[PDB]
Nucleic acid binder design. Structure first.
Lengths: 53, 65, 83, 141, 240, 167
RNA sequence: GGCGAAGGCGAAAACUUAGGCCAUUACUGACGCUUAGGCUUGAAAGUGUGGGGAGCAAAUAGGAUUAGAUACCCUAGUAGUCCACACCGUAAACGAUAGAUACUAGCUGUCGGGGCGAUCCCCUCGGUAGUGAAGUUAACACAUUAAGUAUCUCGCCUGG
């Protein structure tokens, strides 16, 4: 995140912010096939879809 | 979601619509997908291109602040 | 959209035409000249190449069918202008 | 009385009619329409006179120059089709010609064959009476 | 009359937005409430013809079983029919390997008879856990197959309140060629049985008069009460 | 053709001098002119480029030769008086129409109902209304009709009926 | 989700061009299918040329388990890479499925338009995942988003 001073609220959002930053940096910090490079995002989206319609 | 789909114009352009942009854009300066924005598919690409222009236009940062 | 209303309305094969053999082939050749100029200006445009081949061969089979189909309704554009 | 999406010009009327009939037999369809064709009118009429066909009607749009023809593939009120299968002997690419000496029975003689001989369509059985041969178009029963 | 329109007020209706057009001659288009509604005059004529057929065949006094539990109200209605006019029934339905082969059910009825005769002696004299086990075997009898006690043959007619709810009762009966009466609601052909009935019971106000009119169309054969055949008697009640 | 241009002037500077230099930059258009003298006032860049914490926003709307705006895209972007030259035209995903304008009654209705501002009505902004009539005005229809009715025989009760009285 | 000759297409912007989609009660009078032959592009790797080389990088150098670790582990590290000319011509280029014609239940939805209609719900036509009856089948399973049915042509396989 950019701000964090709350005791219990902002940390949970910061967790997903860090997860998003990791997902965004795990495609350009190391060169690889674009196949899996996009498959990771597509599979994350698919997993997030069917769990909660 | 966008007012443009609710009025009918079939396109948008950067006329400093930043207000509605803040509904589509997280405070993290990253474009949320079609789910959050609420466009159907056409205004979705319109707001996508507008947000990308704003990135180019420096209306919205890429990530740097 | 290079030409859509020029040659199909200024030229009337029969009593009235909105789409026919020779108006279509004349517009097709106008777009052929336009596309050849475009690809001479920009050599790496292949979609135009395939479209031009399709257009010219469709024109050729248009003329081939119109040979027998009508006595003489094709002797206005059977040639090419690219030399 | 067209079904939907009016039928355009196929490669040959008989093939389009065969598709329509097979689809009627498969997907529970009763009345089917085909492009205007005099041979279609003749074959529908002779199938009606044969007893395997229901009502057939020529159809026109806002204009009368274009035409189509619809017909009810004869279904009894207990969901059974009168026509159970078709086969074409003559094909657009190969119009097989069989003279009067080349008219046998239909797989036991139970079926019906059709020939385009001189004018209109004649059954091979009645064509053999007039010592008439010709190009046989289809076998049906 | 029979199948009168006083019985058809919200009788029609089914699941929202899920239907196959295999139902061709009885279901009307639905997009207002998505609950598939149906035409009524055709149902009246078909059900009157079916009543004539069932009374004619019931004058021979054939065996009939009550098997349908689409909703709780269907269960209540079939219980009412069993307590008023019955010759044999099954609690829920055949569980498979029981309809196209009644050996597994003839032995079931014989074992029920012998189990009652044997448990008449069990008076908590050997093991109390074991007499609870026997009472629980009886309980499982009522749950799985408590209805098969008086049916000594294969019924000539089998009621099917839903082709999607009576898998065994339809399939095993269709292995043989016994006459079968079934409904057709939203996703099946109306031609899977001998006589056609496109009626439904999923609606709360439907199965009441449906079951009453079916029951009083056969109950007259056994010289038993008949109160829904042409009488103005009717019910407007929710499913329960 | 039609051309709306969004201007990004370099860094923080006076409004009028930037307007004049943006006019000079519009002069680089050979014949794309007919501008309406206006601007978007002051709007700062949300992020520092490397030392540019703010800028000024100007809009220029006019028409001309479409080929002759590429040279503007060169000159404005190169010269240190414009940073971004945003162009509007049909190549960017277009939807405009000069006859779809009679839909601004829906604009007023949605401004009213983008969020229901009354305590009595607090419906979600994404819920139906259903005054529905279902207008089509596009069907591709053909008026097929029967003129010769031969062989009277039809198939309407195609549902099975069988298995009469059984003992 | 759409646009896509395939290969694909996303920091933007625009010149241009192409393909559309919906609707036109319309015209040449069906003027079109496949493709011998000819034409065209072709993911990507890499190549000579001139330049650039930021960055990583094979091969590996060295080092860690090791019976061997040569494959998998870490660092140093160049060919390579990269920009254009010329050459690249293949991919698990696939839809494991060449097409074109005509026809054939549906449905949850949704997309582009014609849209009445805050948006809507609701559709008309084309599209986008599934669905299941006919149909299909060695079975997988497909099914009007056929592996369904018929018409015309190019490519192929006759056991390994």
């Amino acid at each position: 995140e950019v701000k964090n001073d709350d005791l219990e609220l902002a940390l949970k959002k910061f967790k997903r912010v860090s997860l998003e930053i990791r997902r965004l940096a795990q495609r350009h910090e190391y060169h690889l096939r674009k196949g899996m490079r996009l498959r990771e995002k597509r599979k994350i989206a698919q997993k997030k879809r069917r769990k909660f319609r | 979601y966008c007012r443009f789909c609710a009025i009918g114009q079939l396109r948008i352009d950067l006329i400093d619509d930043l207000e509605a942009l803040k509904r589509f854009l997280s405070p993290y300066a990253k474009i949320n997908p079609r789910r959050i924005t609420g466009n159907c598919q056409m205004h979705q690409r319109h707001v996508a291109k507008a947000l990308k222009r704003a990135r180019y236009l420096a209306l919205v940062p890429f990530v740097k602040d | 959209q290079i030409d859509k209303n020029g040659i199909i309305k200024s030229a009337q094969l029969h009593d009235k035409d909105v789409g026919s053999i020779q108006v279509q082939v004349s517009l097709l050749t106008s777009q052929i000249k336009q596309l050849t100029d475009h690809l001479l200006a920009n050599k790496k445009d292949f979609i135009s190449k395939r479209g031009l081949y399709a257009k010219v061969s469709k024109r050729k089979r248009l003329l081939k069918y119109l040979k027998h189909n009508d006595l003489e309704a094709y002797r206005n554009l059977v040639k090419t202008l690219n030399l | 009385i067209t079904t939907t999406k009016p039928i355009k010009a196929h490669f040959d009327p008989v093939a389009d009619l065969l598709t329509k009939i097979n689809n009627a037999r498969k997907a529970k369809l009763m009345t089917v329409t085909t492009i205007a064709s005099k041979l279609k009118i003749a074959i529908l009429e002779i199938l009606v006179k044969e007893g395997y066909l229901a009502n057939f009607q020529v159809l026109e749009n806002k204009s009368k120059t274009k035409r189509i023809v619809t017909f009810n593939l004869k279904y009894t009120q207990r969901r059974i089709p009168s026509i159970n299968g078709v086969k074409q002997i003559s094909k657009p690419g190969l119009r097989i010609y069989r003279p009067f000496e080349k008219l046998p029975l239909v797989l036991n003689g139970l079926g019906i064959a059709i020939i385009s001989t001189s004018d209109g369509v004649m059954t091979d059985k009645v064509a053999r009476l007039k010592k008439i041969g010709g190009e046989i178009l289809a076998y049906v029963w | 009359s029979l199948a009168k329109l006083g019985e058809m007020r919200t009788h029609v209706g089914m699941v929202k937005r899920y239907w196959n057009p295999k139902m061709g001659f009885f279901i009307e288009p639905e997009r207002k409430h998505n609950n598939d509604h149906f035409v009524l005059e055709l149902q009246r004529q078909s059900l009157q013809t079916a009543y004539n057929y069932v009374k004619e065949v019931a004058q021979n006094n054939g065996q009939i079983l009550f098997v349908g539990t689409k909703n709780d109200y269907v269960k209540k209605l079939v219980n009412n029919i069993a307590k008023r006019v019955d010759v044999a029934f099954i609690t829920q339905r055949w569980l498979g390997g029981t309809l196209t082969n009644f050996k597994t059910l003839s032995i079931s009825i014989n074992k029920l008879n012998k189990l009652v005769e044997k448990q008449a002696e069990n008076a908590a004299d050997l093991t109390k856990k074991e007499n609870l086990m026997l009472s629980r075997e009886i309980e499982r009898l009522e749950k799985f197959f408590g209805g098969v006690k008086s049916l000594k043959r294969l019924p000539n007619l089998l009621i099917v309140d839903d082709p999607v709810y009576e898998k065994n009762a339809v399939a095993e009966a269709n292995i043989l060629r016994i006459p079968v009466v079934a409904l057709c609601n939203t996703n099946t052909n109306p031609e899977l049985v001998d006589f056609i009935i496109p009626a439904n019971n999923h609606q709360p106000q439907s199965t009441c008069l449906l079951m009453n009119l079916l029951a009083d169309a056969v109950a007259e054969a056994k010289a038993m009460p008949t109160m829904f055949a042409y009488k103005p008697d009717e019910e407007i009640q929710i499913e329960i | 053709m039609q051309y709306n241009i969004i201007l990004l002037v370099d860094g923080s500077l006076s409004l009028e001098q930037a307007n004049q230099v943006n006019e000079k930059q519009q002069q680089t258009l050979t014949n794309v002119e007919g501008l309406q003298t206006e601007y978007l006032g002051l709007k700062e860049l949300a992020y520092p480029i490397k030392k540019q914490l703010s800028a000024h926003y100007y809009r220029w709307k006019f028409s001309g030769d479409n080929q002759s705006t590429k040279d503007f895209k060169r000159t404005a972007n190169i010269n240190k008086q414009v940073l971004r030259e945003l162009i509007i035209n049909l190549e960017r995903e277009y939807g405009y129409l000069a006859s779809i304008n009679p839909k601004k009654q829906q604009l007023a209705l949605q401004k009213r109902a983008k969020y229901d501002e009354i305590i009595a009505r607090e419906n979600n902004p994404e819920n139906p209304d259903v005054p529905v009539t279902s207008g089509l005005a596009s069907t591709q229809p053909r008026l097929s009709r029967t003129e010769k009715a031969q062989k009277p025989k039809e198939e309407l009760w195609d549902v099975v009926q069988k298995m009469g009285n059984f003992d």
